[PDB]
Amino acid sequence: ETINKLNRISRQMLQEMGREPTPEELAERMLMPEDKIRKVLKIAKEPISMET
Amino acid sequence: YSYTEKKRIRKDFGKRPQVLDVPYLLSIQLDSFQKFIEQDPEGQYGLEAAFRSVFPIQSYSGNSELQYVSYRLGEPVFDVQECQIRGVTYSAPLRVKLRLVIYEREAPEGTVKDIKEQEVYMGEIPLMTDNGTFVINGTERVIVSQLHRSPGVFFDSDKGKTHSSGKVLYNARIIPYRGSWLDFEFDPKDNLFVRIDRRRKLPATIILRALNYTTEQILDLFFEKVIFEIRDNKLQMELVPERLRGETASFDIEANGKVYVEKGRRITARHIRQLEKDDVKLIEVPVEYIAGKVVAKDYIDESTGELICAANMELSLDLLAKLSQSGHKRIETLFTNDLDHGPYISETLRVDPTNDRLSALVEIYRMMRPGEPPTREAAESLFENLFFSEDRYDLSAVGRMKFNRSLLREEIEGSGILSKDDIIDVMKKLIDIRNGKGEVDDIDHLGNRRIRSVGEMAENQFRVGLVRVERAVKERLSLGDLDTLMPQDMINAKPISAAVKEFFGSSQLSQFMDQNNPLSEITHKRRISALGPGGLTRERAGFEVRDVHPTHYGRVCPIETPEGPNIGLINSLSVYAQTNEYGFLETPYRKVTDGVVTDEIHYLSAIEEGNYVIAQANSNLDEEGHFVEDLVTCRSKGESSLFSRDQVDYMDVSTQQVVSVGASLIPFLEHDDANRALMGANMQRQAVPTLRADKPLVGTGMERAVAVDSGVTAVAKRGGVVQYVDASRIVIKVNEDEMYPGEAGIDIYNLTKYTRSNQNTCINQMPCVSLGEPVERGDVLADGPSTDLGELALGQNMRVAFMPWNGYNFEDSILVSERVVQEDRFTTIHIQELACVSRDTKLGPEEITADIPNVGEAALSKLDESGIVYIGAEVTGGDILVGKVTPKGETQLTPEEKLLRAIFGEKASDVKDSSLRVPNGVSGTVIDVQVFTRDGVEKDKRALEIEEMQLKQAKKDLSEELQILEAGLFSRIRAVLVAGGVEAEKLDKLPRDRWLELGLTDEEKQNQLEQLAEQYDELKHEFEKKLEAKRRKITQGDDLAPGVLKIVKVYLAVKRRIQPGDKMAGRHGNKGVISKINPIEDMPYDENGTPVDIVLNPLGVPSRMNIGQILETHLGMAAKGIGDKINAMLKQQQEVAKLREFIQRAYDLGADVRQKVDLSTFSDEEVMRLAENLRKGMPIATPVFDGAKEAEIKELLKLGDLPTSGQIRLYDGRTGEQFERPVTVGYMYMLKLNHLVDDKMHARSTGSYSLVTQQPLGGKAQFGGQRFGEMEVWALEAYGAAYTLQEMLTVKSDDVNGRTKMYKNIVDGNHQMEPGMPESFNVLLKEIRSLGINIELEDE
């Protein structure tokens, strides 16, 4: 759910900021300590198929 | 004549005047993208078009509509250079106005509210540079134009191979630009069939029923009517006299009380004429003739109301009786002939399982989406959404065009969807072809071949993006509230952005520009491909499409195309070729009206060129240009032969246009076999730029156009005098006539300096002009890599001797003197970009710090306090460019190591050395360093130093701009003030800043002063904003990948000259590898004592037939002759007279050439410069097929003092004795391809290994071992070597144990092996056993 919340911000703030919000923007936009972005944004990603 | 043409002139042989001169070679690339992104106030192809297609997007019935208004492309976030350095994409934001309207429920249609959301941002789109290139990640890239089957209808044969009955077949295919394919095909039984796409075969009529056509109307469409009358009793027949053609009388044919034909007499033209003039409309026929006839329409009994016979049913003698007593007079039947008009559709109906429209739609919907239960709305929606939907289907303009044209229609433009009339007409055409009237088209023909390009394809991808955004728009407009959301929350960015990014980033057609060479770029940007999306593959299309077609003439170069897996699947665009209005290929011609050959140009497409008879590029005409011969070689339709003096409609424009720019650079091409010519023009693109750009000594005259049109050089935007010349920049003062009234101004050119090229070679520009020199508009202001004085030098000419020298030249091998490696001419500069990545591991962050565990003082010496190598420091293999250290804690050592540490008291570091070190064996000098930092992490010491430095340099640059510009502007005010206000000495006294107050007498010059004021202040503030922006661009942290904190890029410039193993070749397709470097001592020389640079092998000449390389030698020699003579006369310092005389004499050369000449040139300061540039040799231009002749070359040799044979006496530099027989010596232009041996060479003992299966794999750039294949294995099997093979596939590779256990023995001095079982097979056991299969190893 925390990841999804980070997607929501990306949506509006994408066109709103004219390019995309800075990696630390959605941080203060979100409740928790906000440095967790880089962390949360990492573990979220699905592993690339090794057979690619 | 131009200004650099006074610097150097190329002597041009050849006769044929050039009526049309070579256009911009980059034409196609720029035009395409120019059409893609642009504002077009109509449906013409562009972003506008693709927008208008999908838009307006409306919700489902909910009357919430989203319509498109207008769009704009914002200024680039980074310019070309900055974006190239940083590595981002050169692009523009796409801002599009969207109007969201909500109709008040229960129309009349009016909106409760309509919010116009201002320009919602969707994606950024790449931009094409003036050179026709794109930058994806910091790298110049090119999108190759595509060649595919043009949309519309096509009729084929497929004779032969199918069924082996020889009966052939006839099929038609409708190929839309987008949407499902529509296919029609016959079969051996002559039953017409139809299939959508490649899907299941269905009887043809089944589609007709889906268009709502009952049987009666199908028959009425495809067959004529034979009328039967039961007047009085016992029948009759309506007879059209032409109907009896191709048939024999079945009975007595008699009418009008006169017997026209008897039984058993075939009806000929005679009987038919007799019937025609006597005009017999009605004849009497037997009741038995209708026994085979097929009744056209349905027939019912008026009384009983029952169906007597169905439409398309065979009549019998009894059925006639049953419908006759019912009161039926007329009976319609099909007009059927097994020769002229065939009874196909009838039998087609006989194979049709369906009856009505609904039934047909059922079978169709069950055909396309089989197995799932059909529905009425489902079949209807499908069939309506296949070929009839404006959305899911279109042929566009080219499609509808070719469609209608092939159908013999009038309208050149029509709807983008199929109509009943269309499908029907197509079927009719196919039936006509089966009937014998009409012919089948071929794919290979360039009229059926369409050429796309960057813009069109980009438009297609953006279209896909727009449809996938459409689905989302409707999806959201489903449940939406009223006045809350707007055209923002719906439309996303990533979907479109990645849609374009996926195209430019990864596509078979999108590739990295090959920039090792000015020819390579320009010949890459002009290229065609039958591969990629919407095209065939190498594994599919056979020899036909690959092969050269007569339509390729003037459109596509026959001899330029890659030799390999795909041959002729690429080709190239020809010299004078152009993209047709509809997207076909058209070539220039010369209209011949009456008997005169006019100089008017005319462009003809592949289809246009067909009927006309075109004359030859090589033909003799004189005076008014009338053909000298009574018959001349020409070509009309598909073929060439002798043609009458005036039958000729047109003629070739040039002796070139058949070939391409690659082939047009091959001198004496006509003397070379096409194979070796192809190889030559293929390798000509591989030439690495030399250290000193030289010049071709033997040319063509295209090399000027190549150099200029390609962006490698720097051309003057406007003409004038050079105010300033630096190796860095060049400032030209503009002439007034070309100059604009406002801003005054001078043209400033910032030259590209030493920087990385895509191929790792060097790209650098040097000024070809000096301080205070007159320059013409559109003249070279400087040369790029491999360019000289406005021409193209891909390499260096040099002295060559043909003779076997001690077998050192053995196959193609080349024996070169030391004179060449000493003169450093063939030397090359490589620029390698090396990277250092600071990442984040769970153990901790990685530091770029100069503090490195386990290194000497000499190791940390070349690094600064921050750990980055100084600019300019020369380095070799093993040197540390960037110190980097990553945490690895608790090494977990072993007992003996622990004792070791206890004795030596060494703290084992918690940090491991990841530092970027120069790759092994390569050596060069550091020309630059960059530091990319995550925005918000503190910049280290070095990075800060660099940043401050860049800031200062920027301020200095901008200040220079403003200074030169301001002085340039005020210098005009000084000049305008003097007119009407003149004070010479009075004006320049007072401060310049205060000049703006002074006025002038009433005139337009006052308003000019005003202009200069406005533009002056504009510049003054523009400086400010530019400085601000530059500073911000410098300071901002670039966005990096996840986990990486900072990145350090070091730019190494390596200089490698030449060594044995390098590849060298002429333009003639003669390869070679430098064998040995031989001292100037052992070099074969002549009586004059001048040694030879290179010794080739004569044996290579006869076999592979390229004789041009010899001619190129001869003329070359002769050319150098004219140089040497001049070189003496300049060293003799005779005078202007003698020199000029000799030069003119050289430029005339016997009789009949098109060159013309001097003494319009200043006889002193100008001529003496030309002679100064000619002393290196006399540059000659040999046109492609118009080139020089033996007699001309021998004559030039006479002028040169050198023998006719081109052969002289040569003495061995060893014994000093003469060589028996004369040897051919001369100057052959030779290139250096980049195959260079210090790249190719690899060696590995024990490297890293693959995880999944343990096998040698390079991870370090330390290369994986050579691959031992099946064939090599067989080679071992043929010999008796078992142990070599075992050690090959076990211990040296696949055995995780055997390798190390081997290594220990190798160092121990024991050669053995303890093989064990290869890990491959060991894994195979597990994979097999992972299934339901038990695999075991028996016995012992």
Ligand SMILES: O=C(Nc1cc(/C(=N\c2ccccc2)NO)cc(C(F)(F)F)c1)Nc1c(Cl)cccc1Cl
């Ligand atoms: O291409 C065809 N003939 C054909 C004729 C000639 C020819 N003269 C020509 C000379 C110059 C240009 C065009 C034709 N002959 O005198 C040359 C070729 C060539 F491919 F080798 F260059 C093919 N025939 C043909 C046609 Cl018309 C249609 C489809 C396939 C073929 Cl194979």
